[PDB]
Symmetry: C3
Subunit: 315 residues, 3 copies
């Protein structure tokens, strides 16, 4: 068995060895839980961003940064791949756990999900459950969790609070930008399962996605980081059997596609904050069908929307 | 001295530590030989593909995967380089050892070739021979070799069978796609030597090549993996002294160039050749000549043929 | 505290463990100094080039090579990033120490600069000084340093000569090409400071730059290596507050921009005092401002001049 919590815990332990290099800071709480600040009150780093992503993917993925250009403008990009996309992306990475402890709220991502079984149906659909006595969660938040939050996470995971780790970074931070574009494979996997395709048919996935510049607040960053994937995220996927339904994976097949997501979200304040869930999806995919030996291409890139998203100013 | 077998054996031991993660499986045979299935009865993985390639290159190259686009369509790519091209590519990686042990027949690649001296003339040309008590062979085949096959390989290498490793993957597998695109440097070096250029004059080489989707059988995969290098593989090379003959390195200088190789292979009826041997060659090269300080560029990319080879289906 | 000397010493120790593989040679002098030839009387290698660069950047950066294309022609590229740009690039990588010991001339880069404080004002500007009893220097020289040269470096750094390491390569070598394209982030950071922008405001930098072919002598190589960055070097940087003056970062804003540096230098009668110092600068930058959330783009790529510089011969 592959234990996403045990594998990710090793990477957290590595982060703990290089805190200053990585520009992160941890604290051991009075109940023994370890809270790793990756960008709330510290700058974080590109490499902290990478490691946060690897942790989110339960250590079952390759994640690297390469610098390249869009229409000549240079950006850092995530390039990543995994041969365990159902476990890495659905059973671990997806921010699928609503943590609510009195007044704290955060969406939880990462290996701890596979212990708490959050949400229940995901683990049934992918046929995975972790068995570990360590739990590792990643939180996107502008506040660090305290002893009571960590206690709750540990009880939900059936682990002692001394054996729980949390990585935390806000949306608008380097680690936020890296870890969100680092979801490019996930967006594909999750959208495929959402439209009815069995994620157990997915053999592997490989993805490229620009890392958003850091915008001036968490709400703008929510927009540009989602946009990295929706307008400029590319995925090569391998599956056992193709289904024609996969034409509906790309975000351009959503009624809500066309503007930066920040603009979509602002416009929705006037309609009960409702937005097509299918919008959250990769820009372009190629699907290599093992049955027929054909590779079906769907979607499109959109540098023009991306540059609006990114608040690019040209001369 | 650099021992391609000893260096590669360290890589194989690493594979053995991460079998489940890499989606491979090994067996230690009665005679002690270690046989590592990388894609016959197991899925393998992008990372097993990289390690298989590193092993073929006698651990004397860098091999990585980077996601990128061809006419907007995303693919995984091999990016690779080596400062021992003669030894890594000709003395090791090239599939130059025909293994036929009555019923079992495979083409053998990798460091074992440098103990068995297969073929003889290669090792005289590059002035290399390995001295090691361990042998590592990579087999492109759809069956795992038994005690008798490994005893044959051991004997040819003058190594006890308990000190022999074999990596095995079929042509149509992820390891097959990665490892064959991984020969991008090798194809250039091999073609250079074939047209009479002394490979001992080659200082280093760096290459990029897309990783073929997996087609529906080994025969179709033979075509598309080869096409990756012939129609879309690029190599930057450094040489001590340039020769005008190097203009005939690229595949497009062959009389047989122009159709997906599968069509070429079963359009002159055969199961080889006359097919022009010179066809097996990189698409495009830049050769930096240390003597004159100039860099000569030859060849061209053909995405149109690659997309045919790859059985791409656009909307 | 981050000690650039102690961190870089670990990398040098890793180089010493793989000399034959990296094609380098070291010698321990009679005073105990360790001189590592990366390219004077040995070929060096792509990997020795990467480690040389990592050392120049005090172990505080990531540096990798990818193969990609410029107008179809393949080159090896450096991709790199750092979350300590002031220390890694100003405090360490910049070749800011002029060494003259009798008739021996060398340019000193890397972590020993942060002990000798060469030049004084840089360390005041970035508010960094190292404390280490090991010194690590990188020398761009066409001759290996002897006992007397190493004694001078040791005394300037207040270290015992037995605790000094030097890496050495000439401009025209693979290491020299890799390491100079390896200065792509540095050239942006240095240029910023030179035009009056406080390097303490710079959060991080990421850059890409092609690696020059090796030209026929050090003079030519000085030209093509510089041109790599000036004509085809791209950087994405993040800063605390923008300043309109950053429009003047790219080389194209220099009065001397436009032809290969070798031609500029010849036309100046080999006198840098006759060349605009603001020429030494990246080709194109994108500057993400944390204050406004905007990303400002400046500069341009120039493949035509690059290909002249590189002494490219097309068919």
């Amino acid at each position: 068995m592959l234990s996403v919590n045990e594998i990710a815990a090793e990477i957290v332990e590595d982060m703990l060895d290089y805190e200053e290099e990585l520009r992160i800071e941890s604290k051991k709480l009075e109940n023994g839980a370890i809270v790793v600040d990756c960008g709330v009150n510290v700058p974080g780093s590109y490499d902290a961003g990478i490691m946060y992503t690897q942790v989110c993917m339960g250590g079952l993925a390759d994640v690297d940064i390469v610098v390249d250009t869009i229409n000549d403008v240079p950006f850092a990009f995530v390039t990543e791949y995994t041969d365990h996309p159902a476990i890495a992306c659905l059973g671990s990475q997806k921010a699928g756990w609503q943590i609510k402890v009195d007044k704290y709220f955060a969406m939880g991502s990462g290996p701890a999900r596979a212990l708490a079984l959050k949400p229940k149906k995901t683990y049934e659909r992918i046929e995975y459950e972790d068995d570990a006595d360590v739990a590792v969660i990643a939180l996107e938040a502008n506040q660090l969790p305290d002893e009571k939050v960590m206690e709750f996470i540990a009880k939900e995971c059936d682990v002692d609070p001394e054996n729980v780790y949390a990585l935390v970074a806000p949306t608008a931070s380097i680690v936020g930008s890296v870890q969100i574009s680092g979801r490019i494979v996930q967006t594909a996997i999750f959208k495929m399962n959402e439209i009815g395709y069995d994620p157990k048919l997915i053999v592997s996935g490989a993805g490229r996605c620009p890392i958003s510049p850091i915008l001036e607040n968490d709400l703008k960053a929510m927009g540009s980081t989602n946009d990295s994937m929706m307008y400029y995220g590319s995925v090569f996927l391998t599956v056992k059997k193709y289904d024609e339904i996969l034409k509906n994976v790309p975000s351009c097949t959503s009624r809500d596609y066309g503007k930066p997501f920040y603009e979509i979200f602002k416009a929705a304040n006037y309609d009960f904050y409702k937005i097509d869930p299918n919008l959250f999806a990769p820009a372009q995919i190629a699907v290599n069908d093992l049955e027929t030996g054909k590779t079906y291409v769907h979607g499109k890139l959109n540098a023009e929307v991306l540059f609006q998203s990114y608040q690019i100013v040209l001369e």
